[PDB]
Write a protein that binds this ligand. Structure first.
Ligand SMILES: NC(=O)c1ccc[n+]([C@@H]2O[C@H](COP(=O)([O-])OP(=O)(O)OC[C@H]3O[C@@H](n4cnc5c(N)ncnc54)[C@H](O)[C@@H]3O)[C@@H](O)[C@H]2O)c1
Ligand SMILES: NC(=O)c1ccc[n+]([C@@H]2O[C@H](COP(=O)([O-])OP(=O)(O)OC[C@H]3O[C@@H](n4cnc5c(N)ncnc54)[C@H](O)[C@@H]3O)[C@@H](O)[C@H]2O)c1
Ligand SMILES: NC(=O)c1ccc[n+]([C@@H]2O[C@H](COP(=O)([O-])OP(=O)(O)OC[C@H]3O[C@@H](n4cnc5c(N)ncnc54)[C@H](O)[C@@H]3O)[C@@H](O)[C@H]2O)c1
Ligand SMILES: NC(=O)c1ccc[n+]([C@@H]2O[C@H](COP(=O)([O-])OP(=O)(O)OC[C@H]3O[C@@H](n4cnc5c(N)ncnc54)[C@H](O)[C@@H]3O)[C@@H](O)[C@H]2O)c1
Lengths: 245, 235, 237, 245
């Protein structure tokens, strides 16, 4: 698959994370413009240098929980490239916190980043969305299988699935809204939990391996591409068969 | 059918609402103890009086979005009845708000009541949950069909479905955690045509499914959210 | 719950099975009339005798894959009790058969019993169904999780879920059509199963019957088209 | 959208149908070898000529309901191209038949073509499937929404969804098994339905249009491509938002 994104503009939050980096690389290689935001301004700027074509790249330090940063992100997209073709709210946190130990602060921090932030970005982006544009949300296996020790994480990822359906109705026919639901992907997000459970996870997985960040990115690219022109409201499971939904 | 909830205690938020009253009514008729909360104390107290078994009913003014009121709600259940058998976080708001017009305040108010509040009640309730207890969440057709002009509402009701699955895992085997997803509960003609059962649902038809999930008839059901919508949508 | 099924009639195939017997026992204890069918006539009659209200029980030898036996089953319900309130096509086979080893006969046998048979029973039952009646199909965890070595079985139980939705539309508002999808029912790999099951036990057949009874009852009067997972949380669908 | 399928072999039943033709065109344009089957061989060969790189196309008259024709189809793929990379059992029938009027013959006809035939093709294909191969089934909106007057059709398409999950477990990791669930597609299958129901369908569809056959083919191609390399067991809704599943 080869994506033709020349002169199409991607806004991607959490761009320095494992899946975020894979998304940026694939879209950049496909000729797209990138507006990358992240809470870690130093890593993002350094990472962007390696992908380097500054004519097609703009970066900004942005907190997913900040409504004003969503406004800055859209204004930068409008100023640099004149609009938005693809919107991907990838920024999120994954905290292991058994429910009996979950503090009110624990709960609010996960909802603010994983859910409120997605609202802020989608809402501020509306005037900048172009014809044939795409929003792609990031759900998770946990929304479908049920989180083991992360009821707040699971809640926000179930919210992603339904929010995708709602916005798919409201922004049609101009904009399509879809999602990707990753399974177990090897990134720093999962590194500590997964180091003693790699064999167990592969044994449970029909494809017998962990997912790669690029295998999430390629599905996001598909959903943004003309190959998905009649797909809207839909969240796709990308988990090697570890779970059937 | 017929439920035997004698000496078992229901905690119900938003108890003065349409579905809320139906739930309180059924569980009360079933012999249960009731701890009812609502933002409208006066309306609630009048309703609770109409059921007339005051020794089995306790009411309190509680804002579903307030963690302090959740603590007071659980303490009241502990004080009057010693624990919680059924926890039903029913309180919620349904605001029609096209997404292009949705304010940050619009968004937060719906998340705070419909989602944060469910976290507060469930978390504070943990020490009070008895053996064989149930949590039953209220999802919505909108979670599955996609809301037409209520993206914040749909988000919170998709969150209920996944949060139900998460807590079912963590609170098992002592407590089962399930949900009910109501359809259209009493352009009516279009709805009748679209509904196989050709009518609107009654609040009593949501309450009876909640009671089923709380009953021993559902003893091997957990994590599950049931569609109660007359066939208007298949999920 | 306690179900009031007096003067209401259940037609149940595979009634001598583990789940089948639990359904019959519950409905009979609830006052219902029973039309029980099974391929094993002697075992069924012995079971039916134990319930002891022979005026409320009628049995017949019937092959679920036989359209003629479906016709005979409904005629028996008509003759003894005048109609059908609850139709539960419970008969099914579960064959372990890795796909690379699956014969054409293996495939056909499972489709014939688990899928063709449900069609024949539902189709022939239509004139006998009463008002406020229910059909409750039996799906399976395998339909949702994906069968490990039973692709034919899994296909038939996915068919149940979609056929339930279809008949729900067509047979409403007179009849509601729903399903129950059992998980792992005691009816080894026990350590593995307990580890994956939040409730930390196998399901009991009586716990499938009580959900079917719920779906047949007025408590489910606004539920149609719906298949309920009854699996102790082993799988979330 | 364009894919790179050179030297990979597609076996496609019902190749002369609306969606079938769109699948064949895309894969051929993408450099694949085609083994096309249909009950209407004159139609198929006439169609096969128009795409014409004829050395990369092999056609055969084959009845999906025949186990022997499935063997002949696989044998042709083996003889001409040495194996099978993509297996797409697209042949199917759609009969409007109210359940109260449905004959036993009606039932068996639909289960035989739409379900037994898929078994015959998948089972006979096993020895010929190559590394990194894909099976992609065709489900339907009817499996999820519930057919209005086609309980046998709805049953077979629900079977596709569950059979896809089962085979993804058994044929992994060598083969991924996925599905596509089309909505309302502009095709002969829907000409009769949409003569009286066109207004309602566009009203109910967020994208406010009928789907095109090519918009099913592009999603099938995605599932066969490396972009879906971590997707198995999965059936994707391609319905313009008319139904959220
Ligand atoms: N296995 C997996 O990694 C997995 C599985 C399922 C779903 N997901 C989801 O996919 C998304 C991306 O995962 P990932 O691998 O990139 O995660 P990650 O933890 O590796 O990276 C997330 C990135 O977001 C940044 N970030 C954190 N808080 C932020 C904030 N307030 N504002 C802005 N940026 C912030 C982090 O610095 C990091 O660069 C997340 O939403 C995650 O929940 C991941
Ligand atoms: N048709 C329906 O009513 C319908 C359909 C689908 C889902 N649901 C869901 O079912 C649940 C119950 O619905 P209902 O019929 O009782 O709704 P309702 O609108 O009739 O209930 C409103 C009640 O909740 C109270 N309330 C409002 N905000 C509150 C707060 N902050 N704290 C405490 N109480 C508060 C109000 O005072 C009132 O008594 C809700 O979660 C709703 O979203 C309802
Ligand atoms: N663990 C489980 O038992 C389980 C799990 C998931 C789903 N289900 C499904 O639930 C349903 C009921 O299961 P069960 O516990 O009764 O199964 P079972 O194997 O205990 O019951 C088999 C019974 O069906 C009868 N039978 C077999 N072939 C028949 C035919 N051709 N015609 C008529 N009767 C026939 C046999 O005589 C026997 O009494 C089945 O459809 C099954 O696939 C069962
Ligand atoms: N709108 C749609 O067309 C639509 C929507 C949802 C799902 N689907 C499914 O997608 C698949 C492809 O549909 P389509 O648009 O190609 O349908 P179609 O009706 O256009 O295809 C008919 C073609 O299949 C052939 N065919 C019929 N019976 C056959 C048999 N026994 N053996 C072999 N070939 C046979 C016919 O000769 C003809 O060439 C089918 O499984 C269909 O159910 C279609």
């Amino acid at each position: 698959m080869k994506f033709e994104f020349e002169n199409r503009t991607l806004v991607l939050t959490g761009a320095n994370g494992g899946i975020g980096r894979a998304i940026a690389e694939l879209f950049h290689a496909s000729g797209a413009n990138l507006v990358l935001t992240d809470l870690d301004r130093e890593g993002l700027d350094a990472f962007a240098a390696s992908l380097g074509s500054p004519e097609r790249i703009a970066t900004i330090k942005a907190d997913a929980s900040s409504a004003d940063d969503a406004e800055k992100t859209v204004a930068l997209a409008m100023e640099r490239f004149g609009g938005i073709d693809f919107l991907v709210p990838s920024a999120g946190i994954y905290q292991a916190k058994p429910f009996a130990e979950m503090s009110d602060a624990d709960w609010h921090r996960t909802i603010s980043i994983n859910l409120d932030g997605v609202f802020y970005l989608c809402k501020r982006a509306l005037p900048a969305l172009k014809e044939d544009s795409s929003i792609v949300t990031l759900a998770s296996l946990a929304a479908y299988r049920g989180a083991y020790v992360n009821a707040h994480y699971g809640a926000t990822k179930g919210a992603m699935v339904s929010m995708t359906r709602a916005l798919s109705r409201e922004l049609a026919p101009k904009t399509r809204v879809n999602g990707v639901s990753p399974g177990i992907i090897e990134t720093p997000m999962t590194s500590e939990l997964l180091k003693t459970r790699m064999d167990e996870t592969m044994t449970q997985t029909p494809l017998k391996r962990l997912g790669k960040p690029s295998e999430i990115a390629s599905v996001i690219a598909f959903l943004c591409s003309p190959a998905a022109s009649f797909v809207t409201g839909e969240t796709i499971q990308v988990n090697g068969g570890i779970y059937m939904a």
